[PDB]
Structures are given as C-alpha cells and as structure tokens.
Amino acid sequence: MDDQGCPRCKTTKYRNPSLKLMVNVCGHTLCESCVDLLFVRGAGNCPECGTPLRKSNFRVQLFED
Ligand SMILES: [Zn+2]
Ligand SMILES: [Zn+2]
C-alpha cells in the first residue's frame, strides 16, 4: 500500500494505508490524492508525462482480487 509513493503528492499510500492510484489514457499513475490536486489545479495533465488528457480520465484501484 506504499510502493514508490504517489507522484504528485508523493505521500498517501506510503503514509495513508487506505487509498489507491488511478491510471490515465497514456497509462501511467495518479494516486488517490493526485486526482484531487491534479484537477482542482488544472485537470488534463498526466501526473508524469503531462499527456494532454482528452478530459480527466483516472481509473483507480488497488484491491485486485
Ligand atoms: Zn498524489
Ligand atoms: Zn502519462
């Protein structure tokens, strides 16, 4: 539930033991705390390759079972 730790707000899953990361079109990674600060401040910019997200798009998950 931690791994390398979120990219934008690198802190959640590593500190927070109850979240998940959502991937986007290009297929990268957006922790739960990212989709919150990534869009509230712009929305449409991958947390890493800044790909021009046609419009948000973040599939979160973690359980896997
Ligand atoms: Zn984050
Ligand atoms: Zn990307």
UniProtKB/Swiss-Prot annotation:
The modification N-acetylmethionine is found at M1. One of its GO terms (biological process) is regulation of G1/S transition of mitotic cell cycle. Stabilizes the cyclin H-CDK7 complex to form a functional CDK-activating kinase (CAK) enzymatic complex. CAK activates the cyclin-associated kinases CDK1, CDK2, CDK4 and CDK6 by threonine phosphorylation. CAK complexed to the core-TFIIH basal transcription factor activates RNA polymerase II by serine phosphorylation of the repetitive C-terminal domain (CTD) of its large subunit (POLR2A), allowing its escape from the promoter and elongation of the transcripts. Involved in cell cycle control and in RNA transcription by RNA polymerase II. GO terms for cellular component: CAK-ERCC2 complex; cyclin-dependent protein kinase holoenzyme complex; nucleoplasm; transcription factor TFIIH core complex; transcription factor TFIIH holo complex; transcription factor TFIIK complex. It is found in: Nucleus. Associates primarily with CDK7 and cyclin H to form the CAK complex. CAK can further associate with the core-TFIIH to form the TFIIH basal transcription factor. The modification Phosphothreonine is found at T51. GO terms for molecular function: cyclin-dependent protein serine/threonine kinase activator activity; zinc ion binding. It comes from the Eukaryota. The chain holds residues 1 to 65 of 309 of the full protein. Keywords: Acetylation, Cell cycle, Metal-binding, Nucleus, Phosphoprotein, Transcription, Transcription regulation, Zinc, Zinc-finger. Its main location: nucleus. A zinc finger (RING-type) spans 6-50. It comes from Homo sapiens (Human). This is CDK-activating kinase assembly factor MAT1. Highest levels in colon and testis. Moderate levels are present thymus, prostate, ovary, and small intestine. The lowest levels are found in spleen and leukocytes.
